[PDB]
Amino acid sequence: QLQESGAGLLKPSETLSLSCTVDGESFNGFFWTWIRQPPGKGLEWIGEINHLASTGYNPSLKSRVTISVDTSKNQFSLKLTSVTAADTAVYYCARGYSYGFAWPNYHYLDVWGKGTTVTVS
Amino acid sequence: QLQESGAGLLKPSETLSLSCTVDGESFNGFFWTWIRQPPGKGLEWIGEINHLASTGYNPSLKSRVTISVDTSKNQFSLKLTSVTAADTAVYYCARGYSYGFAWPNYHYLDVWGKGTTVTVS
Amino acid sequence: QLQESGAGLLKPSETLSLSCTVDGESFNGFFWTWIRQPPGKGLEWIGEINHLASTGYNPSLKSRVTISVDTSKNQFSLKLTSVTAADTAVYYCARGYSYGFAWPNYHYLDVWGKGTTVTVS
Amino acid sequence: TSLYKGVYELQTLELNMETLNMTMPLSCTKNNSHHYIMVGNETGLELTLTNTSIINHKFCNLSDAHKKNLYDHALMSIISTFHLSIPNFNQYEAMSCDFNGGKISVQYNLSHSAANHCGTVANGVLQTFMRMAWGGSYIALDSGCGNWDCIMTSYQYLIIQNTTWEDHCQFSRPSPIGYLGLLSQRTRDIYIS
Amino acid sequence: TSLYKGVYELQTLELNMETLNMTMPLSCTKNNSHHYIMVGNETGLELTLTNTSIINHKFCNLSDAHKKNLYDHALMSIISTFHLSIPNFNQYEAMSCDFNGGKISVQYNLSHSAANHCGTVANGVLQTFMRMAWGGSYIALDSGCGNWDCIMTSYQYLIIQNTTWEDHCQFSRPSPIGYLGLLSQRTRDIYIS
Amino acid sequence: TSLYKGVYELQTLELNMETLNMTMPLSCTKNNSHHYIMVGNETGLELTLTNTSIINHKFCNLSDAHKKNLYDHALMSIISTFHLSIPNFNQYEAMSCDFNGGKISVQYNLSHSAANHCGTVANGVLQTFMRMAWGGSYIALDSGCGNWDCIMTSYQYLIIQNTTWEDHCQFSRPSPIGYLGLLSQRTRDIYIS
Amino acid sequence: ETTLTQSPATLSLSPGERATLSCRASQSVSSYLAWYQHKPGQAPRLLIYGASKRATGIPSRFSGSGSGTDFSLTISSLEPEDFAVYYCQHRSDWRTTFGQGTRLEIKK
Amino acid sequence: ETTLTQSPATLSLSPGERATLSCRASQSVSSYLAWYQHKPGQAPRLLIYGASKRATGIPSRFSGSGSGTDFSLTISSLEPEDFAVYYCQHRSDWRTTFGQGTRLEIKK
Amino acid sequence: ETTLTQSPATLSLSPGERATLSCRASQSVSSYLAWYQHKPGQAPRLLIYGASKRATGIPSRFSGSGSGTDFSLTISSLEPEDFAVYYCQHRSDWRTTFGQGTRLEIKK
Amino acid sequence: GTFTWTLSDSEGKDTPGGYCLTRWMLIEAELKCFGNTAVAKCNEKHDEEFCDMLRLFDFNKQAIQRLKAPAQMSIQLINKAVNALINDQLIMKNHLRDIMCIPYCNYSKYWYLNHTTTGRTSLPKCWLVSNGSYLNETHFSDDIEQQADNMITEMLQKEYMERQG
Amino acid sequence: GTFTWTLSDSEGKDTPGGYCLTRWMLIEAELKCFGNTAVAKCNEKHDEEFCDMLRLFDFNKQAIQRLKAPAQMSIQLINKAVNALINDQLIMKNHLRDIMCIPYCNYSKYWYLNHTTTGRTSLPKCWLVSNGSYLNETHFSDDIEQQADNMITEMLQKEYMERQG
Amino acid sequence: GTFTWTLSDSEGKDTPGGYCLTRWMLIEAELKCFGNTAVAKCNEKHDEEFCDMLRLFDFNKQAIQRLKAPAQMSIQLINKAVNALINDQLIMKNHLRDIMCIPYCNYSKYWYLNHTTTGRTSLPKCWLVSNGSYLNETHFSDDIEQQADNMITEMLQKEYMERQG
Ligand SMILES: *[C@@H]1O[C@H](CO)[C@@H](O[C@@H]2O[C@H](CO)[C@@H](O[C@@H]3O[C@H](CO[C@H]4O[C@H](CO)[C@@H](O)[C@H](O[C@H]5O[C@H](CO)[C@@H](O)[C@H](O)[C@@H]5O)[C@@H]4O)[C@@H](O)[C@H](O[C@H]4O[C@H](CO)[C@@H](O)[C@H](O)[C@@H]4O[C@H]4O[C@H](CO)[C@@H](O)[C@H](O)[C@@H]4O)[C@@H]3O)[C@H](O)[C@H]2NC(C)=O)[C@H](O)[C@H]1NC(C)=O
Ligand SMILES: *[C@@H]1O[C@H](CO)[C@@H](O[C@@H]2O[C@H](CO)[C@@H](O[C@@H]3O[C@H](CO[C@H]4O[C@H](CO)[C@@H](O)[C@H](O[C@H]5O[C@H](CO)[C@@H](O)[C@H](O)[C@@H]5O)[C@@H]4O)[C@@H](O)[C@H](O[C@H]4O[C@H](CO)[C@@H](O)[C@H](O)[C@@H]4O[C@H]4O[C@H](CO)[C@@H](O)[C@H](O)[C@@H]4O)[C@@H]3O)[C@H](O)[C@H]2NC(C)=O)[C@H](O)[C@H]1NC(C)=O
Ligand SMILES: *[C@@H]1O[C@H](CO)[C@@H](O[C@@H]2O[C@H](CO)[C@@H](O[C@@H]3O[C@H](CO)[C@@H](O)[C@H](O)[C@@H]3O)[C@H](O)[C@H]2NC(C)=O)[C@H](O)[C@H]1NC(C)=O
Ligand SMILES: *[C@@H]1O[C@H](CO)[C@@H](O[C@@H]2O[C@H](CO)[C@@H](O[C@@H]3O[C@H](CO)[C@@H](O)[C@H](O)[C@@H]3O)[C@H](O)[C@H]2NC(C)=O)[C@H](O)[C@H]1NC(C)=O
Ligand SMILES: *[C@@H]1O[C@H](CO)[C@@H](O[C@@H]2O[C@H](CO)[C@@H](O[C@@H]3O[C@H](CO)[C@@H](O)[C@H](O)[C@@H]3O)[C@H](O)[C@H]2NC(C)=O)[C@H](O)[C@H]1NC(C)=O
């Protein structure tokens, strides 16, 4: 029913600057998630953000990554400064949910984008 | 019955520095007013001050004029820095009152000084 | 029953740095007092300190003397910077008490150390 | 008089609530633009509804007011009681003071903006006022009764100042009730910090 | 019915405490993870006990919340009433807010450390909660009764947010009592600064 | 005994207000220089009127006192209740503390200047004291009764510290009334900021 | 803010004739206008305040009224002594202005 | 913090056989693990959440359970279409991780 | 602040005679003075406190009294062992001073 | 009106008799009216849940009918009215009874006695609850009989005074 | 004294009978004394304006007479006394009645009944006001008759007990 | 229980009769029980020191027995209970009487009357103190006789109703 979609480019230096445009359904009810998959590797989490711009990040990227939200366009853009050879990965933007009520609780990412490939050549 | 009186001098540069000594009746019940009349012009308001040193000023003089009060001598002195060719006017010191009660209200200046002539030659 | 005891050295320059080790009985119930006696002079007070490190000092030494307490070793050390020819005195460490209740009240120093001699040669 | 049941005269008392000045503040109203609170036979406060202001700035230097102690303690107590009773006082730019020399002058800015959008500043200030001068306040504000929550007047400022004792009462009998009414329920409708 | 003394039928009334919404807030409980306070037939607050958080920082910008006035006054009054009723609230790092745009979301961190060492944060927050949602709160917290001073739950966060009116009541009848219970005794168990 | 009306013996009860220690604080007086508040059979506070001081500075680091939580909660509650009950406490330089390690010592400076000019600091502090130790406080201050507003003593300092439980009562029976008397009317005579 | 305009900059009647000087505001006037009489070499004197109050020493020859944005000064007979300069005065909270000034002249 | 480990990095059965993929946590898991299926060239798809919920479009072939530190993904018959890569997902307040990834392979 | 003065800087009696050493304050003394005995080469010893208290190990030979600004140390018979140096001590809140010191001498 | 309501209204009498609870005030019920004797009793009671609620309901009736609030609930009206409408001792009492595990009033259902003839009724008393449910009559049948004895006593006293007057 | 005043004084009896209001306490009046029965009634009333004022007046009498304040009004005495002198419910009640446009008490004039013989009197009740003026008797003649009936009833009950004793 | 305690407990009846004070509750005394009539009187009294203390003592009994506080006194229980347990007017009243130099109650000893036969007793009233000591009977013998008259009156009224019923 819903489909998330972003944009990006190959980026040899500077900042990664990826963007994700959210579909029109329930922007404020979910945790916006950015993940990464370098060739030869499994999935990595980059960070997450909600509509109040409350965020959390993978500590290894704390000094380089800042995730922003702009609710007036249901669009949140990934940001990764000092992009390098180790960041040559496919990036994905996904919608997540955490049922923190009673017990058992749960978490998942349901609607996924198609994947943006970024290299630094 | 009452008569306000000031002092001043011709003042080519620096600061205007005019002084007004208040008569002995009801210093704290009135708004002290400074006005100006350049030759060829009508009356202009400079600013006003009360006994709590609460003031208001003509915006065109905001950067040059500061009106002070010293209640321990019922004397308030006009101050106008960077005095110039455009300030060559007769200055007057007057007592004002505003009846801000019910409706209609009103305002006037009743006791007037005689006028101090200041030029910048 | 109780005996206070300190340590020190002859000290030509720098800082006096005297130490007093308190006996095991009631550290927190008394005002710790430092006094001085230069040859040819009577007794002088340097300053006093309690267990909350609340202090008072002889004003003439305000710029040079700081008295410290370390309750974890029942040891308080005198400190006097810029030590000079006028500080060539016997120093004593004593326990004091002030009965500030009803009337008459009183104050005294009961347990005394033996005296530390410090010169600046 | 009216002989209720043929045997009971209907008689009245009126209390001389003036003799109470030695122990408790008494308030009363002069016309509609002047309301007074006396704290004995020497001094008191004037509360006026005006369309002019005395103070043209945004400072109320309460810290200095208390570092020094040049003010009458009862008069300061009354100012506090009035101030702390204003509900939902979220806008502090509306209050200015001149606590210099022990003199007290406190202004509350009742200006809108938006009137129809009631419940901002003027409402809470005027509701507090109606209790402090209760019984002599009914002609000071427009639209008496009607609502409880959109209290408004034609006046832009409420100004409270220190004065001398004079009888000062012409519209209402002096009464301790206004002050006492705001003595209790001192801490209500307070927003977090 | 039961004919007490052979002549008195035992009969009952149940009060429709819904018609009271026009004048006073009403609270009720949905399951155990959701508690609501309505302030009329339009809006209200949701109070939830959750194991997730929305706000991942330590700021509650109350000064800005009041410089601007974009918030509903009744909803802010209720948040204040809840907050100021928390006894011994010495730890302020436990409270975070997002008062931006007039929107209200307030979080209280109930995490321990040490649970057995009760009476720190979660206890005071949960005790306040039990009064605000009183009568529908008894299944929300564990160890109901037992003690009065070691109130704990399995949940790490109490989150209060602004919402829309919907019936929202399935576990308890709507009641004005919770709010009213915290209206009085507003200033108790307050530590000096 | 006295046989009132020839048929009624006049008999007495005296209440053992000691058994109340499990639920509520009890206060009593030793001579005139020592007043105690117990919070159970383990610890409590000593309140003394002295002509010496422990703290020779002007700091009371309440913010740090609460950032850390090393203090007994009941004892802090009592200190707050005492402090917040002091009317018109405009002079804060009169209060100093040492909240380091969880230890509590609080001093109030009762020194004049001007005594005849009563109602500054010592009066409010001593009036609060007379309620906290009520019934055993009547011999601690001079000029008992006489006025209500010029309460003075020969002592320069009121010092409150944490101690251990000992019987500690020789001048008055233990009583919950002093503490309870200051529990209510917690927020009165408060100056604006 | 608000301003005042006095349209009849120069008005000429012989002494003994009745005349008026109008004054208009840009906005409904907060408060009421005051009028001043000024002589060539002295000081301004309050003539009328609150649109219609004549104060004390001012003769009955001077009167006036106004409301809204439209005010007027009436001199009932123009005594020769009154042929000088008149000004409008308007005060708002902490701000005040004056009109341009209008002058009376004697003609033959 | 916590981590996940998936021991069966490579698992090989013919299509039609039943198989499972285990997943272990370093600490009792806060919450429950989710499983994802990934294809070589597409995007990850949620397969199971909360240890046992199959969501919507996922066929009955996929199930699972777990508690504590020990979780497992069960594929009832390994349809040829399912022979790709699986991952464990775990979320703590504001933090989340993934397992290493395990792969299924068809043998002859 | 306050100071102490001891007038009898040198006092000489034979052993066995009774003698006193006076001490005066500049202001009514806050509290009461203490007296110390000092020997040439040891440490000061508390002799009397609170004007009249003899403490413990101090013999009955030593007594004293005082009030206001005027205090005095009395030695009932001057034992030869007591012919040394005496000092007044005064403490105010967080401040204290000493007198100049007076000395006893044996004459023949 | 004759019950001297400590309310913003002075005329709480819609019809002769006690205060009536109408169709919109009761759940799954129509109109239930109590006599004036029973209602008047609350004039001097400082420990009764039922009349604590009558004060809030009557307050609301008047607050809605006479004054108008343009937007929101204008919550300040209740915030300043409650100290005069509600006996706080009752809320605190029932809260304490709840924390201590004994039956308490949560202000929902009330039990009253209604005589088979004359129609005389007693004031409703709160139907107490514990452990998520209402107590059965067995647990408080003693309280119901005391109330029945009180109604009988009052009727006999009334007859006595009619005989004397 | 016999009215067990919730005041700082224990002896409020200047003369046998009720509390008296003297020349300086009343406006344009001399001395008016009420009997002890009427005054004693306020011992248990939690809804009466007249005796709320008697408590303030008697408090003031004692506060002035026994303790002395060297300067100012020493306002702290009233600030800490009021919760025990005044039934706050009454102030809030009358304030609410005022905001809602119905007659309310502003504590000025009080109406009482005085029997043409014996001199028995009732407690004064507040003369309510609305729209800037006092209400005419017509508007509350019903309340005056209820009070008259109550006085009659009490006299008859007194006679009954005298006959029994 | 039958005294409808404004307490956290609902069953304050340990034995038929009034509330009893046991060996650990009284100083240098064993068990003293009052009848139910005297205790029931406090159900409607808003000016009585003795029953203000009964509420604290009974509260403490229950607070200790039913709920457990692992450490410290968990002082919050009293801080939130007092407004419902104590009539603050009484503390403020006695404090004011003390500052104004008249006899006041410091809640220690209480005087009661005990009939030589039947064993009927009155509610204890506070034994007032002044200038550091208890007042002698001479100073309040008048109050003791009024209480004795009240006991006699009540017994006669009881007999009257037994004769009527
Ligand atoms: C003092 O304490 C007492 C004792 O604890 C409290 O008493 C309780 O109060 C609650 C709330 O008023 C009562 O719950 C209501 O009960 C209705 C009857 O069904 C329920 O009870 C039966 C039998 O016990 C259960 O079998 C039902 O549960 C089953 O069905 C529900 C359906 O949703 C499921 O959720 C369950 O899982 C079960 O399958 C019920 O619990 C019940 O109908 C009512 O729910 C309807 O009404 C509410 C009103 O908001 C709606 O939110 C809800 O969605 C339902 O609405 C439907 O019907 C209406 C028409 O009537 C339509 O308009 C809607 O669109 C929709 O189709 C609610 O569950 C509880 O029974 C009662 N306990 C006792 C012992 O009496 C007091 O409240 C408390 N008082 C105070 C002041 O604190
Ligand atoms: C309302 O106001 C009234 C009126 O003011 C107050 O009434 C007073 O309350 C106090 C405290 O309860 C009573 O004091 C107690 O009295 C006991 C009896 O001896 C005392 O009175 C006699 C006669 O008046 C005096 O001669 C005694 O004084 C002499 O002896 C004492 C001994 O210490 C010396 O200190 C004095 O200098 C005199 O030499 C007494 O004043 C008295 O025994 C009791 O003291 C014992 O008990 C306390 C309890 O904590 C101990 O702290 C203390 O150390 C004593 O304990 C010894 O004995 C016990 C066994 O019983 C052992 O276990 C201990 O180890 C130890 O050996 C205390 O002094 C006062 O009498 C009473 N006044 C009147 C007129 O009745 C009300 O309290 C007040 N109520 C409220 C609620 O505010
Ligand atoms: C409003 O309050 C202020 C502050 O209390 C009042 O001003 C003060 O008035 C007193 C006199 O009542 C002044 O003290 C004395 O004045 C005499 C004058 O001859 C002088 O000889 C004495 O030595 C002494 O100074 C006080 O200085 C003055 N303070 C200030 C700040 O003005 C003011 O009068 C009150 N307002 C009204 C209307 O009364
Ligand atoms: C929680 O509170 C916030 C703040 O009040 C709510 O958001 C606000 O919703 C209103 C509409 O109810 C918005 O105003 C209007 O929106 C329409 C939309 O078409 C627009 O055409 C109007 O011009 C006007 O802007 C308001 O802007 C919006 N503010 C914010 C900060 O979002 C929020 O909806 C509440 N939560 C829930 C669940 O209702
Ligand atoms: C006034 O309050 C302070 C703070 O609570 C009290 O000092 C504290 O006393 C406890 C023991 O009661 C100390 O904890 C334990 O001490 C033992 C000593 O052997 C040690 O083995 C344990 O590991 C543990 O540390 C605590 O550290 C100490 N804290 C401070 C700041 O001193 C003080 O005793 C109270 N005053 C009076 C008169 O009791």
Side-chain angles (χ1 to χ4, degrees), chain D residues 70 100-104 162-164:
Chain D
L70 303 176
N100 291 284
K103 188 179 293 190
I104 299 173
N162 76 275
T163 190
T164 63

Side-chain angles (χ1 to χ4, degrees), chain D residues 5 14 16 23 145 179 184, chain K residues 25 60 79 88 101 109 149:
Chain D
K5 307 293 181 175
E14 187 179 355
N16 192 23
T23 301
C145 184
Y179 175 78
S184 294
Chain K
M25 296 177 80
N60 184 56
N79 289 348
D88 284 346
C101 292
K109 296 178 178 296
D149 285 341

